[PDB]
Design an enzyme around this catalytic site. Structure first.
Site, PDB file in Angstrom:
ATOM      1  CB  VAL A  91      -0.906   0.004   1.236  1.00  0.00           C
ATOM      2  CG1 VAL A  91      -1.789   1.256   1.255  1.00  0.00           C
ATOM      3  CG2 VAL A  91      -1.738  -1.243   1.275  1.00  0.00           C
ATOM      4  CB  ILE A 145     -14.306 -19.185  20.721  1.00  0.00           C
ATOM      5  CG1 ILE A 145     -13.181 -18.808  19.764  1.00  0.00           C
ATOM      6  CG2 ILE A 145     -14.119 -18.491  22.111  1.00  0.00           C
ATOM      7  CD1 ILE A 145     -11.861 -19.459  20.078  1.00  0.00           C
TER       8      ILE A 145
HETATM    9  C1  LIG Z   1      -6.737 -12.251  15.736  1.00  0.00           C
HETATM   10  C2  LIG Z   1      -7.269 -13.476  16.406  1.00  0.00           C
HETATM   11  N1  LIG Z   1      -8.155 -13.304  17.405  1.00  0.00           N
HETATM   12  C3  LIG Z   1      -8.624 -14.428  17.967  1.00  0.00           C
HETATM   13  C4  LIG Z   1      -8.242 -15.705  17.594  1.00  0.00           C
HETATM   14  C5  LIG Z   1      -8.785 -16.925  18.304  1.00  0.00           C
HETATM   15  N2  LIG Z   1      -9.659 -17.794  17.466  1.00  0.00           N
HETATM   16  C6  LIG Z   1      -9.289 -18.987  17.014  1.00  0.00           C
HETATM   17  S1  LIG Z   1     -10.512 -19.770  16.160  1.00  0.00           S
HETATM   18  C7  LIG Z   1     -11.596 -18.451  16.436  1.00  0.00           C
HETATM   19  C8  LIG Z   1     -12.973 -18.478  15.837  1.00  0.00           C
HETATM   20  C9  LIG Z   1     -12.925 -18.798  14.361  1.00  0.00           C
HETATM   21  O1  LIG Z   1     -14.266 -18.857  13.824  1.00  0.00           O
HETATM   22  P1  LIG Z   1     -14.578 -19.269  12.337  1.00  0.00           P
HETATM   23  O2  LIG Z   1     -13.498 -18.720  11.432  1.00  0.00           O
HETATM   24  O3  LIG Z   1     -16.004 -18.956  12.088  1.00  0.00           O
HETATM   25  O4  LIG Z   1     -14.417 -20.808  12.474  1.00  0.00           O
HETATM   26  P2  LIG Z   1     -15.236 -21.997  13.122  1.00  0.00           P
HETATM   27  O5  LIG Z   1     -14.450 -22.391  14.372  1.00  0.00           O
HETATM   28  O6  LIG Z   1     -16.581 -21.449  13.481  1.00  0.00           O
HETATM   29  O7  LIG Z   1     -15.234 -23.097  12.026  1.00  0.00           O
HETATM   30  C10 LIG Z   1     -10.986 -17.460  17.163  1.00  0.00           C
HETATM   31  C11 LIG Z   1     -11.580 -16.165  17.611  1.00  0.00           C
HETATM   32  C12 LIG Z   1      -7.278 -15.773  16.544  1.00  0.00           C
HETATM   33  N3  LIG Z   1      -6.802 -16.941  16.085  1.00  0.00           N
HETATM   34  N4  LIG Z   1      -6.820 -14.652  15.953  1.00  0.00           N
HETATM   35  C1  LIG Z   2      -2.367   1.631   7.171  1.00  0.00           C
HETATM   36  C2  LIG Z   2      -2.110   2.824   6.311  1.00  0.00           C
HETATM   37  N1  LIG Z   2      -1.455   2.626   5.151  1.00  0.00           N
HETATM   38  C3  LIG Z   2      -1.263   3.719   4.397  1.00  0.00           C
HETATM   39  C4  LIG Z   2      -1.674   4.993   4.749  1.00  0.00           C
HETATM   40  C5  LIG Z   2      -1.383   6.184   3.864  1.00  0.00           C
HETATM   41  N2  LIG Z   2      -2.588   6.816   3.258  1.00  0.00           N
HETATM   42  C6  LIG Z   2      -3.066   7.998   3.636  1.00  0.00           C
HETATM   43  S1  LIG Z   2      -4.390   8.490   2.720  1.00  0.00           S
HETATM   44  C7  LIG Z   2      -4.300   7.059   1.755  1.00  0.00           C
HETATM   45  C8  LIG Z   2      -5.324   6.812   0.685  1.00  0.00           C
HETATM   46  C9  LIG Z   2      -6.728   6.978   1.219  1.00  0.00           C
HETATM   47  O1  LIG Z   2      -7.688   6.775   0.158  1.00  0.00           O
HETATM   48  P1  LIG Z   2      -9.238   6.976   0.352  1.00  0.00           P
HETATM   49  O2  LIG Z   2      -9.630   6.505   1.735  1.00  0.00           O
HETATM   50  O3  LIG Z   2      -9.903   6.425  -0.851  1.00  0.00           O
HETATM   51  O4  LIG Z   2      -9.290   8.527   0.291  1.00  0.00           O
HETATM   52  P2  LIG Z   2      -9.146   9.639  -0.826  1.00  0.00           P
HETATM   53  O5  LIG Z   2      -7.779  10.278  -0.581  1.00  0.00           O
HETATM   54  O6  LIG Z   2      -9.182   8.935  -2.145  1.00  0.00           O
HETATM   55  O7  LIG Z   2     -10.331  10.605  -0.552  1.00  0.00           O
HETATM   56  C10 LIG Z   2      -3.267   6.254   2.168  1.00  0.00           C
HETATM   57  C11 LIG Z   2      -2.854   4.939   1.593  1.00  0.00           C
HETATM   58  C12 LIG Z   2      -2.335   5.095   6.010  1.00  0.00           C
HETATM   59  N3  LIG Z   2      -2.778   6.267   6.492  1.00  0.00           N
HETATM   60  N4  LIG Z   2      -2.558   4.000   6.763  1.00  0.00           N
END
Ligand SMILES: Cc1ncc(C[n+]2csc(CCOP(=O)(O)OP(=O)(O)O)c2C)c(N)n1
Ligand SMILES: Cc1ncc(C[n+]2csc(CCOP(=O)(O)OP(=O)(O)O)c2C)c(N)n1
Ligand SMILES: Cc1cc2nc3c(=O)[nH]c(=O)nc-3n(C[C@H](O)[C@H](O)[C@H](O)COP(=O)(O)OP(=O)(O)OC[C@H]3O[C@@H](n4cnc5c(N)ncnc54)[C@H](O)[C@@H]3O)c2cc1C
Ligand SMILES: Cc1cc2nc3c(=O)[nH]c(=O)nc-3n(C[C@H](O)[C@H](O)[C@H](O)COP(=O)(O)OP(=O)(O)OC[C@H]3O[C@@H](n4cnc5c(N)ncnc54)[C@H](O)[C@@H]3O)c2cc1C
Ligand SMILES: COC1=C(OC)C(=O)C(C)=CC1=O
Ligand SMILES: COC1=C(OC)C(=O)C(C)=CC1=O
Ligand SMILES: COC1=C(OC)C(=O)C(C)=CC1=O
Ligand SMILES: COC1=C(OC)C(=O)C(C)=CC1=O
Ligand SMILES: [Mg+2]
Ligand SMILES: [Mg+2]
Ligand SMILES: [Mg+2]
Lengths: 594, 594, 198
Positions: free
Chosen positions: A26, A480
């Site tokens: 990005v 979960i």
């Molecule tokens: C960022 C993050 N937050 C929380 C978890 C813990 N976690 C593992 S499985 C799960 C639920 C996944 O649900 P889904 O993708 O619907 O699968 P299902 O078990 O229902 O088949 C969570 C929250 C994780 N792995 N990553």
């Molecule tokens: C995580 C992240 N990656 C990159 C940026 C840099 N950034 C600032 S504005 C922008 C584009 C935003 O586009 P949009 O939301 O479509 O707004 P527009 O400027 O087109 O009105 C980016 C990539 C950021 N702020 N955060």
């Protein structure tokens, strides 16, 4: 030869010499000079993600798809780099590299609070092999040079390179003709270590080889199979070694552990008297309590990383080696042992392992409405070819998928086994497809995982990157819900709601067909198990016609408890087991794959 | 009184005593005991996010909505905590708190590679006031006790508390009746400091007050206005102070800086001979080069944090103080000066400032098809009431929004001014609505920002959380296209594609109406400027009828260059300026707000 | 062959195989098992210093005297490690190694403010190629093995190995006959580069 150019222009030459052809990212103001150098040079194909976290998991999938790949993730200063920490952790956790590159504020403003300047070097150090803010334009090629050495050497891991804006545009003299990649460091086991390992293996009466991701990391799968074949020793892949020997090979004895494991795998491990560990660590989800895993068993551990040996259990023999170096010597010595008539015959033990594999099964052939998830994986095994490449993350979706799918080549199970960050699946699958447009990529997600980075589907639409995403929808964080049963709890894990635009989802909440279609992709919803197979056939056709991702959503029953437990001998079977092929018709023992 | 209970049960009592009523999160195995304690205790309303990053920005919006709020973000071990780093950074960057709570592996497995165990304490330290893994169950209430002290005291900032699973379930004795929150530390300026500040202000002939987020952080907006009123000194809010004096107040002189600034604001600053800085820092996007910002100007700086004074420029007078403490004394002293007849009359200088405000405008009333974004903000000013509360992040969407919208109360501009992480907008708006269901929340996003965490709209659907999301769609990363003009570049910043499901989006790529509807929300697309006003009226009605988020998508012309530059006196006006109300009809000088 | 011994006994065999013959140090209760292992094994001559900083600069001079030498400095927990920081800085700064070994509190007491316990691993990290508190007795030979690779490879630099008391005295199986030093990493210039320089 030599020429004045911007440091980012030299960076392009270095990346080209290091084999880089693709990047995910990005752009933003602080990183614009690098994008400028990328346009001027040509030769790197950029894929625009719709979340920086998406660019970072695309880089991981790209690295994981093909040995020697290094996925590149690009972003700007500030929150771009903090959006990369989850991928850096996930890549570190599995011992694979990605190269993250962030823009940064100009050097002379680094400890002022310049707009969107953050100390990413400090934040990323715990989850990387190197994380450095480059403070001289002339060091830009040298830091990338060291980064590639570190990403390939030793235990592999990722690198973050942070580039102050003034450092990027500053002029340096650079001669691409004189640039050379650094040699890669990999320790190799001595013949004395390997001969000792083979003597112990020969003395064992019921050995297994536990083949880990280090075998795949080393591009040594064929040697792993050759060594097992010469010694007639059954192979248990870890989740990260899955595919290094084909699932229909006569010696492949199944997987072991607390969750992504087979009943026959755990039984064969507990019946064995040696574990010959190659390129594995002994992860807690694979071992349970180590005292039980090792009971009555000699343990050999070969690892490229010295401080992995003895970390969770004491091996009888630890050997520091790259897995390819070690397997080359293991094949050589076993061949010398075989010419000498010193390798024991192992027909009974192999037959005993094959008997557990034939009999200790879990049912998949359910005609239930609403659909049972285990039926989805049976249909996937029949629909897709032997060359299928699965991409998945975590959830009951993924656990049962590993229990019930089958894979036949290395790097056809692409799974973030140690860190499991939800949202990984779609971008990782897109990164694999970018690594190999001929690869037959099929992803598996639960509904929650699918929602985290659902917008990445539009990356597949914009770039016409085709693959099939199987989506098994229980309107639950199912994994979960199941672990909350230990607390007699079912709390804040449901995703259901009456969708005011879709009575046809019947209270399941999000309409994944409408979302996938709005994001430029194709989608099919399946309510009945007999419609799964035609849907996969339609999906293959839509993929060819439109060249975009195609989602097949299977509406599941709300609650299914997947088999798992706390020890190898304590795995609880909640759903029906099976001792007959009719209930489990896609076990390789009963079905010819392609 | 005293009772044995799990440490997480004591944590619930502490959170209740500290004023917590709401939390945002995603459960998992390692954090399940805390969710169990939450169900058993009651009194905390949990909102399930569809990305941990979403839960973390909901917590930020909740903190920012109402003085004294502290948003709570909950998640499991491993990648849950790494998904929180961007919010911790964003909250630290703006000096506001959130409380992140992560599960962790049991203590005795912390430096093994336990499944999904990560050193979040190390990763989060750079972006938090405290980040600690709690190693004794008895310390759980004490660590939360210190966390609340730190989140409220001094310069505010966020805290991460990481809870090993065994520490959570361990039994402790705890007496909630005896728990007491710690006193809050805030230094206060002495009367001698304030009298000196007022003497210098009285000697100035053309002063302005620059009112920063510290005024709002301190809940001191009414005192800020009272002090400006007593002294008749025009007020320039920083982006983070915007709203501490109403935009239609006679002394509100506009905003200053390189981007989110008014032509009249910059002109009034450059014409002034003193900047009386209260609760601001002097951010680079607000000052440009400090040598130009300070030329010919005395500088006063009041900040709660000693190492912010003198950080980017040398004040003539620096004072360490909480802004409410300082403004209380500033009002008192100015009243004594006024009774003594010592405050100068400032009619000419105030009239000169008002003359720039009447004349130095930018056109918004465009009848162009495709729509011009500046017309959207004119319609927003007319459609919504004086009590509107805007939520936004970054992009040309947000920059022009700050140039052209108007706000009339503190905490009615909710904007992550220093870190600007794309995807912040939807979850931040949901967190504000959770903080105050009567608040009239309207969010502004560009299409890219909207896509990052687009799935959070289903949180609004599942929980029936109503607000209006204005979506200005140029199928571009527009801000980045514009900054690439400096490199004669337009490269990897376009989001357009022919959507195979929607010829009606005319090559703009993602169909936001279909995605929003699939996620359970309502949506309207507008192609012509005269349809914007009816759409906002329909949106208000759909919000009342269905109680879910309602998206109004305005299809913009692909390319619009928003006014900006590198110095206060170098801001380039690309689009038409205006000196007359007909072209800029919603300037407060021409329009009565509600 | 393989035998049961304490981790510090296994450390003695590793140090011997890696060529160590000398150590400069100051004993204390938290490093006494290592001194007991030294006395039983024999074959490392200990020089007792009259300041820990003096041991740490003796280790430096021993390294610098002769190519391939690695001076070894030994101390107890707490202030002993903080007394070695100046030498770790001096050795890092000149790209030469010393091996510092400190005693430490038992793991079960590592963040409990135990007597003379300090986060030496955090303090020494900026001035060393590796600084690690060893958390498993079986890792003691392996951490030492990697340290010697690090001190010889690339740009050389010093290492601090920090040993919890319970980690030192725990028994492990270790076969000295199978131990092998790791290969040293040193990049080499290609002929094309050298011809260009000439
Ligand atoms: C960022 C993050 N937050 C929380 C978890 C813990 N976690 C593992 S499985 C799960 C639920 C996944 O649900 P889904 O993708 O619907 O699968 P299902 O078990 O229902 O088949 C969570 C929250 C994780 N792995 N990553
Ligand atoms: C995580 C992240 N990656 C990159 C940026 C840099 N950034 C600032 S504005 C922008 C584009 C935003 O586009 P949009 O939301 O479509 O707004 P527009 O400027 O087109 O009105 C980016 C990539 C950021 N702020 N955060
Ligand atoms: C929900 C869930 C359930 C799971 N259930 C299980 C289960 O039941 N069983 C299971 O086994 N796993 C399971 N996993 C995966 C598990 O968490 C680990 O990721 C996995 O077991 C580790 O595989 P491995 O031991 O091969 O180690 P890897 O992570 O693959 O690494 C092993 C070693 O390879 C070494 N190495 C790297 N490069 C080389 C090289 N060139 N040569 C030699 N060595 C090298 C590294 O130093 C490392 O120590 C599960 C994951 C999830 C998310
Ligand atoms: C695209 C973009 C463009 C922007 N353009 C501009 C622009 O043109 N102009 C502009 O001004 N901003 C602009 N901003 C916002 C800018 O980056 C900063 O976030 C903002 O200027 C900082 O506001 P402030 O000086 O009030 O500081 P704040 O971040 O609000 O903090 C000021 C001080 O308040 C102190 N403080 C905290 N609590 C208290 C208390 N109780 N009492 C007293 N002091 C306290 C802190 O110690 C801190 O030093 C822009 C942002 C973006 C994303
Ligand atoms: C899934 O959303 C949630 C609810 O919705 C019903 C609840 O009632 C509770 C208690 C938690 C929650 O996350
Ligand atoms: C003949 O092929 C077959 C095997 O290999 C011998 C097996 O191990 C099993 C379990 C089944 C089978 O059909
Ligand atoms: C937006 O996606 C992108 C392209 O698509 C046309 C390109 O051609 C290039 C060069 C970069 C890119 O991100
Ligand atoms: C009379 O009300 C008005 C003001 O306040 C005096 C102003 O400053 C401006 C610019 C316009 C106005 O109408
Ligand atoms: Mg689910
Ligand atoms: Mg998302
Ligand atoms: Mg846009």
């Amino acid at each position: 030869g030599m020429a004045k150019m911007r440091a980012v222009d030299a960076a392009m030459y270095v990346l080209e010499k290091e084999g880089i052809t693709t990047a995910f990212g990005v752009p933003g103001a602080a990183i614009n000079p690098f994008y400028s150098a990328m346009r001027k040079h040509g030769g790197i194909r950029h894929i625009l993600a719709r979340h920086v976290e998406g660019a970072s998991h695309m880089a991981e999938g790209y690295t994981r798809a093909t040995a020697g790949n290094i996925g590149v993730c690009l972003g700007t200063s500030g929150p771009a780099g903090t959006d990369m920490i989850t991928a850096l952790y996930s890549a570190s956790a599995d011992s694979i590299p990605i190269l993250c590159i962030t823009g940064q504020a100009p050097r002379a403003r680094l400890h002022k609070e310049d707009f969107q300047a953050v100390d990413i070097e400090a934040i990323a150090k715990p989850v990387s092999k190197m994380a450095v803010t480059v403070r001289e334009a002339a060091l830009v090629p040298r830091v990338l040079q060291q980064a590639f050495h570190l990403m390939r050497s030793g235990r592999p891991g990722p690198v973050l390179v942070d580039l102050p804006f003034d450092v990027q545009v500053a002029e340096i003299e650079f001669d691409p003709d004189m640039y050379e990649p650094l040699p890669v460091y990999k320790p190799a086991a001595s013949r004395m270590q390997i001969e000792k390992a083979v003597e112990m293996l020969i003395q064992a009466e019921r050995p297994v080889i536990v083949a880990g991701g280090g075998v795949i990391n080393a591009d040594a799968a064929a040697l792993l199979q050759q060594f097992a074949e010469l010694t007639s020793v059954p192979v248990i892949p870890t989740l990260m070694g899955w595919g290094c020997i084909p699932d229909d090979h006569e010696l492949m004895a199944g997987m072991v552990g607390l969750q992504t494991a087979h009943r026959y795998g755990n039984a064969t491990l507990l019946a064995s008297d040696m574990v010959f560990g190659i390129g594995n660590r002994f992860a807690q989800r694979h071992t349970g309590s180590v005292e039980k895993y090792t009971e009555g068993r000699k343990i050999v551990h070969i690892d490229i990383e010295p401080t992995q040996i003895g970390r969770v259990l004491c091996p009888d023999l630890g050997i520091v080696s790259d897995a390819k170096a070690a397997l080359t010597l293991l094949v050589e010595v076993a061949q010398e042992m075989q010419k000498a008539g010193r390798l024991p015959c192992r027909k009974e033990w192999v037959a005993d392992c094959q008997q557990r594999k034939r009999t200790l099964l879990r049912k998949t052939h359910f005609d239930n409405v609403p659909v049972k998830p285990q039926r989805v994986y049976e249909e996937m095994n029949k629909a897709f070819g032997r060359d299928v490449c699965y991409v998945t993350t975590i959830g009951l979706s993924q656990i049962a998928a590993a229990q019930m799918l089958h894979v036949f080549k290395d790097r056809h199970w692409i799974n973030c086994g140690q860190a499991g960050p939800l949202g990984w699946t779609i971008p990782a699958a897109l990164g694999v497809c970018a690594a190999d447009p001929k690869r037959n990529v099929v992803a598996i997600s639960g509904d929650f995982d699918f929602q985290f980075l659902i917008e990445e589907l539009a990356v597949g639409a914009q770039f016409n990157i085709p693959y099939i995403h199987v989506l098994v929808n229980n309107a639950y964080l199912g994994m979960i819900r199941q672990s909350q049963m230990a607390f007699d709890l079912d709390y804040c894990v449901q995703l259901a709601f009456e969708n005011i635009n879709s009575s046809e989802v019947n209270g399941y909440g999000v309409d994944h067909v409408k979302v996938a279609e709005g994001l430029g992709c194709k989608a099919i919803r399946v309510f009945k198990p007999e419609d799964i197979a035609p849907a996969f056939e339609q999906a293959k056709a839509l993929m060819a016609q439109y060249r975009v991702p195609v989602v097949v959503e299977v509406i599941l029953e709300r609650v299914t408890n997947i088999s798992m437990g706390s020890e190898l001998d304590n795995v609880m079977e909640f759903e029906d087991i099976a001792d007959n092929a009719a209930d489990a018709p896609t076990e390789t023992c009963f079905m010819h794959y392609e």
